[PDB]
Structure 1
């Protein structure tokens, strides 16, 4: 996963690039979930990454987008 959130890139934009790479692999829902729990959080910028980790297990993409909106 080459996609990483720029320090000034809105989270939703990063999410869209991330999902574009994910779609290329025709990932299942299970894989999509694993990727959202791991790489999406791990590849987020400093500001966002901290917040996203604070959400805890099972946080949804929706909850992550809300947490880092702007």
Structure 2
């Protein structure tokens, strides 16, 4: 891991953000 190191693509921050964002919007639609 040297040139194949700084790949740039978040997963565990960003899809424990989405699921929470999707039940936040499924309280904007209906809580």
TM-score (norm 2): 0.43
RMSD: 9.6
* Over 3 Å off, 4+ runs: 1-9
TM-score (norm 1): 0.23
Structure 1, unaligned runs of 5 or more: 29-70
Provide the aligned length of Structure 1 versus Structure 2: 28
Q: Radius of gyration: which is bigger?
A: 2
Change (3 A) 1:4 1:14: farther
Structure 2, unaligned runs of 5 or more: none
Q: Which has the higher contact order (CA 8 A, sep 6+)?
A: 1
Residues 4-38 of structure 1, C-alpha deviation per residue, up to 9 Å, x if partnerless?
9999962000001111110012189xxxxxxxxxx
